[PDB]
Scaffold this active site. Structure first.
Site, PDB file in Angstrom:
ATOM      1  N   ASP A 157       8.215  -8.125   0.261  1.00 48.85           N
ATOM      2  CA  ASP A 157       7.301  -9.140   0.742  1.00 48.85           C
ATOM      3  C   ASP A 157       6.746 -10.063  -0.300  1.00 48.85           C
ATOM      4  O   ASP A 157       5.639 -10.559  -0.132  1.00 48.85           O
ATOM      5  CB  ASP A 157       6.143  -8.498   1.486  1.00 48.85           C
ATOM      6  N   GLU A 158       7.490 -10.308  -1.372  1.00 49.55           N
ATOM      7  CA  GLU A 158       6.993 -11.233  -2.377  1.00 49.55           C
ATOM      8  C   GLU A 158       8.025 -11.820  -3.289  1.00 49.55           C
ATOM      9  O   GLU A 158       8.989 -11.177  -3.673  1.00 49.55           O
ATOM     10  CB  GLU A 158       5.924 -10.592  -3.214  1.00 49.55           C
TER      11      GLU A 158
ATOM     12  N   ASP B 179       3.346 -14.083  -1.375  1.00 54.33           N
ATOM     13  CA  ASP B 179       3.160 -12.736  -0.853  1.00 54.33           C
ATOM     14  C   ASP B 179       2.814 -12.718   0.635  1.00 54.33           C
ATOM     15  O   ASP B 179       1.744 -13.158   1.022  1.00 54.33           O
ATOM     16  CB  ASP B 179       2.042 -12.055  -1.638  1.00 54.33           C
TER      17      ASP B 179
HETATM   18  N1  LIG Z   1       5.717   3.756   3.051  1.00 53.74           N
HETATM   19  C1  LIG Z   1       4.863   3.046   2.331  1.00 53.74           C
HETATM   20  N2  LIG Z   1       4.939   1.706   2.330  1.00 53.74           N
HETATM   21  C2  LIG Z   1       4.093   0.956   1.604  1.00 53.74           C
HETATM   22  C3  LIG Z   1       3.109   1.536   0.818  1.00 53.74           C
HETATM   23  N3  LIG Z   1       2.435   0.565   0.225  1.00 53.74           N
HETATM   24  C4  LIG Z   1       2.968  -0.596   0.617  1.00 53.74           C
HETATM   25  N4  LIG Z   1       3.978  -0.365   1.456  1.00 53.74           N
HETATM   26  C5  LIG Z   1       4.856  -1.377   2.111  1.00 53.74           C
HETATM   27  C6  LIG Z   1       4.372  -1.754   3.518  1.00 53.74           C
HETATM   28  C7  LIG Z   1       3.608  -3.054   3.243  1.00 53.74           C
HETATM   29  O1  LIG Z   1       3.595  -3.853   4.428  1.00 53.74           O
HETATM   30  C8  LIG Z   1       4.589  -3.675   2.254  1.00 53.74           C
HETATM   31  C9  LIG Z   1       3.882  -4.836   1.543  1.00 53.74           C
HETATM   32  O2  LIG Z   1       2.858  -4.306   0.700  1.00 53.74           O
HETATM   33  P1  LIG Z   1       1.562  -5.145   0.240  1.00 53.74           P
HETATM   34  O3  LIG Z   1       0.996  -4.384  -1.058  1.00 53.74           O
HETATM   35  O4  LIG Z   1       1.820  -6.578  -0.049  1.00 53.74           O
HETATM   36  O5  LIG Z   1       0.444  -4.905   1.373  1.00 53.74           O
HETATM   37  P2  LIG Z   1       0.469  -5.608   2.827  1.00 53.74           P
HETATM   38  O6  LIG Z   1       1.252  -6.841   2.718  1.00 53.74           O
HETATM   39  O7  LIG Z   1       0.662  -4.465   3.732  1.00 53.74           O
HETATM   40  O8  LIG Z   1      -1.113  -5.925   2.710  1.00 53.74           O
HETATM   41  P3  LIG Z   1      -1.618  -7.171   1.826  1.00 53.74           P
HETATM   42  O9  LIG Z   1      -1.781  -8.396   2.857  1.00 53.74           O
HETATM   43  O10 LIG Z   1      -0.729  -7.504   0.689  1.00 53.74           O
HETATM   44  O11 LIG Z   1      -3.116  -6.805   1.341  1.00 53.74           O
HETATM   45  O12 LIG Z   1       4.850  -2.598   1.342  1.00 53.74           O
HETATM   46  C10 LIG Z   1       3.000   2.935   0.795  1.00 53.74           C
HETATM   47  O13 LIG Z   1       2.125   3.477   0.129  1.00 53.74           O
HETATM   48  N5  LIG Z   1       3.883   3.690   1.569  1.00 53.74           N
HETATM   49 MG   LIG Z   2       1.477  -8.786   0.949  1.00 50.99          MG
HETATM   50 MG   LIG Z   3       3.243  -7.350  -1.965  1.00 50.38          MG
END
Ligand SMILES: Nc1nc2c(ncn2[C@H]2C[C@H](O)[C@@H](COP(=O)(O)OP(=O)(O)OP(=O)(O)O)O2)c(=O)[nH]1
Ligand SMILES: [Mg+2]
Ligand SMILES: [Mg+2]
Ligand SMILES: [Mg+2]
EC number: 2.7.7.7
Length: 342
Positions: free
Chosen positions: A106-107, A8
């Site tokens: 992203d995973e 991830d």
């Molecule tokens: N437009 C939109 N995109 C989202 C939302 N939630 C997640 N994404 C997209 C942008 C995030 O960069 C991508 C990857 O989600 P992740 O759940 O793995 O979180 P991220 O990698 O941002 O943080 P993390 O390091 O996993 O805690 O999914 C949302 O609620 N709205």
């Molecule tokens: Mg992530």
């Molecule tokens: Mg993810």
DNA sequence: GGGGGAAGGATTCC
DNA sequence: ACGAATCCTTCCCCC
């Protein structure tokens, strides 16, 4: 038996941004989705940790983010970029197993049973990959490992960020009994709430409840999912997934119910969808409208043949008239979604 | 009764 | 105050 390796990427959209303009690193970064109704309307898609510490996370409005972090950097979401970057990194992983399932952008899950012998050698395959990505692409990721995908993934939830963590058979056992049922993938709010009731706080509590009662409560797919998972025997394989539908939904500068001022937004949606289809030809089409009070209504249609762009334009209008007809509320967000590709 | 499938809403987050 | 896989409920044609 089997070992799965879950990968991830950390705060992915925010991080591809820090990479393309490194000057940003260390500062509060927020990738937005500017719905364009009024300066700063829209939600936050994600933000780096150097900014998530203050509650600014995916979901909250951009106006609320600016009240908390007035001076953080706000960038608009550039999907195609993040998309082509994910693709590159996905290749890099194949050079470890060609038994790869790509969950989201992203995973990924890798089946490394025919490349590794044990959790000591797996941990290494793990560390090795992170490097292969921190060097090749400059993106840090978390890595989880275990028997089935579910647990491999739960492993990564604990090791975030920039982590790696193995979950061995003794661990599974204790988690099945200690882990909070809400922290199990595929169990959002509406389900955790429905579990509290039935009095199930842990995964294990499902082994002491009449199955048919569970089924009626959350559904059979969830019941079997949870039960087998708790019985220590969930084992779905790592299959390659395929795009099953493509769509686009847009927000109008203002509410409305006038088929004439709506048509434009609807054709934009259709346009952006047919382009981002490429090759593929859909047999089914749906129109989706988000009412003024945040509820969704949808009307579709399946054809015995595929759909031409020209037909899309025409059937979207009928389905849209069907919506405005059977519903009193004003429409706020309108869009289309194509499925059932030939 | 029960397959097969289309429609529209619900739930999740991967 | 921003794209999509999967599942559930319901309706329906037919044998
Ligand atoms: N437009 C939109 N995109 C989202 C939302 N939630 C997640 N994404 C997209 C942008 C995030 O960069 C991508 C990857 O989600 P992740 O759940 O793995 O979180 P991220 O990698 O941002 O943080 P993390 O390091 O996993 O805690 O999914 C949302 O609620 N709205
Ligand atoms: Mg992530
Ligand atoms: Mg993810
Ligand atoms: Mg949850």
């Amino acid at each position: 038996h089997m070992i799965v390796l879950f990968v991830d990427f950390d705060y992915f959209y925010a991080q591809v941004e820090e990479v393309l303009n490194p000057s940003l690193k260390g500062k509060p970064v927020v990738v937005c989705v500017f719905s364009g109704r009024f300066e700063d309307s829209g939600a936050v898609a994600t933000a780096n940790y150097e900014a998530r510490k203050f509650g600014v996370k995916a979901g909250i409005p951009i106006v609320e983010a600016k009240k908390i972090l007035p001076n953080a950097v706000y960038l608009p979401m550039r999907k195609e970029v993040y998309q082509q970057v994910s693709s590159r990194i996905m290749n890099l992983l194949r050079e470890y197993s060609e038994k790869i399932e790509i969950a989201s952008i992203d995973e990924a899950y890798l089946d490394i049973s025919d490349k590794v012998r044990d959790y000591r050698e797996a941990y290494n395959l793990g560390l090795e990959i992170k490097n292969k990505i921190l060097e090749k692409e400059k993106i840090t990721v978390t890595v989880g490992i275990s028997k089935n995908k579910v647990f491999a993934k739960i492993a990564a939830d604990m090791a975030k960020p920039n982590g790696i963590k193995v979950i061995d058979d003794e661990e599974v056992k204790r988690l099945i009994r200690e882990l909070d049922i809400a922290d199990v993938p595929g169990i959002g709010n509406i389900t955790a709430e429905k579990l509290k009731k039935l009095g199930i706080n842990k995964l294990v509590d499902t082994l002491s409840i009449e199955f048919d009662k569970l089924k009626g409560m959350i559904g059979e797919a969830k019941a079997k999912y949870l039960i087998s998972l708790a019985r220590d025997e969930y084992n779905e394989p790592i299959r390659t997934r395929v795009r099953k539908s493509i769509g686009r939904i847009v927000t109008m500068k203002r509410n409305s119910r006038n088929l004439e001022e709506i048509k434009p937004y609807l054709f934009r949606a259709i346009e952006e969808s047919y382009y981002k289809l490429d090759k593929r030809i859909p047999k089914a089409i749906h129109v989706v409208a988000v009412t003024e009070d945040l509820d969704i209504v949808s009307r579709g249609r399946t054809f015995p043949h595929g759909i031409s762009k020209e037909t899309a334009y025409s059937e979207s209008v009928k389905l849209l008239q069907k919506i405005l007809e059977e519903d009193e509320r004003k429409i706020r967000r309108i869009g289309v979604r194509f499925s059932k590709f030939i």
